[PDB]
Amino acid sequence: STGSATTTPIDSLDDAYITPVQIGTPAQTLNLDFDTGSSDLWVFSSETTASEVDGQTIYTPSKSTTAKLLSGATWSISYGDGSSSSGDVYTDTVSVGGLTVTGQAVESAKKVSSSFTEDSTIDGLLGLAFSTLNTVSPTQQKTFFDNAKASLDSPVFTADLGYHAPGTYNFGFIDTTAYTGSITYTAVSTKQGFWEWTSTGYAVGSGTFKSTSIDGIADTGTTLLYLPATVVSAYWAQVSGAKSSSSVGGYVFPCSATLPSFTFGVGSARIVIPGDYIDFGPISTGSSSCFGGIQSSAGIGINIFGDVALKAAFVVFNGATTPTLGFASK
Numbered sequence: 001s002t003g004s005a006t007t008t009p010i011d012s013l014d015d016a017y018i019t020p021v022q023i024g025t026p027a028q029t030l031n032l033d034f035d036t037g038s039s040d041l042w043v044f045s046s047e048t049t050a051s052e053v054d055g056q057t058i059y060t061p062s063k064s065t066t067a068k069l070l071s072g073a074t075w076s077i078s079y080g081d082g083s084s085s086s087g088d089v090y091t092d093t094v095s096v097g098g099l100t101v102t103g104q105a106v107e108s109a110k111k112v113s114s115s116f117t118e119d120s121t122i123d124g125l126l127g128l129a130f131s132t133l134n135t136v137s138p139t140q141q142k143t144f145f146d147n148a149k150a151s152l153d154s155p156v157f158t159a160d161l162g163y164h165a166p167g168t169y170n171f172g173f174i175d176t177t178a179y180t181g182s183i184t185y186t187a188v189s190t191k192q193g194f195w196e197w198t199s200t201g202y203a204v205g206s207g208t209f210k211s212t213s214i215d216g217i218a219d220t221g222t223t224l225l226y227l228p229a230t231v232v233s234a235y236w237a238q239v240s241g242a243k244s245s246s247s248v249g250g251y252v253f254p255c256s257a258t259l260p261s262f263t264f265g266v267g268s269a270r271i272v273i274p275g276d277y278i279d280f281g282p283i284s285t286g287s288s289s290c291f292g293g294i295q296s297s298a299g300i301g302i303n304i305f306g307d308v309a310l311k312a313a314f315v316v317f318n319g320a321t322t323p324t325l326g327f328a329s330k
């Protein structure tokens, strides 16, 4: 089997991407944020505290003939950005792009933090990291990908995120029309439950490539590219008037600037992030200070290859016995 679904940016800055997912019988379609940095499939639901729902589509298990309470099971998650949600668990049929899993754990939110309530366009999360990070207790549950894997033509999914445009998530096959050149594969460590890999270095604009190992994770649910402070300072030093602002919470730059590209290494291959991808617009409406798409990872404890980076590439998440990541230009 295979599945193919279009992913659409929620706003004009590509802060996140939503992908329609069918849950239950008859289908309830919710728009979920596919997140390769976490391992819970959770939804706004009929059980969500009413004051914490503001425009989201909700899953109502009582209206699904295939929904079953997973008795006793609870979940609670906290994310890199301070947001959280918690609740109880149903099993139900879940379909993405034509690919169906029966008996998928659907985590129903009773509580969500303010950042979720405020995002009316995101009806929940579909986690695509390793199932070792799943928060269901007392019985940990599998991700949608882990449940689908055995049925798939190939044990893979691909992320093809658009710049200010829709893209695609594919399950079970590699669309050889979706990328240019070849795919370079690189080793993954699953020791922390993430798609953790080692970049081979970077370049700023037309500058020389610096060979240096940068461990990090490929995280579709993280907007920006977080890299060591040395690398980030080297990038922003090429933009006149850029500075790190403690008041704003990162590097900002004049919105009159033309930003240089950023290149990262994947083995002997190179992925180029155009400068425009690094512009996250005014810090506040009407400001002439713009927020940068490349930020320091110092304090976060890990480097994150978020959407600023992955949207520049066709990315293969290879879930074979020995997982690997693949990157191609597009």
Ligand SMILES: Nc1ncccc1CO
Pocket (backbone or CB within 6 Å): 035, 037, 038, 079, 080, 081, 083, 219, 220, 221, 222
């Ligand atoms: N990957 C993620 N998923 C959900 C919330 C936050 C992040 C990253 O901080």
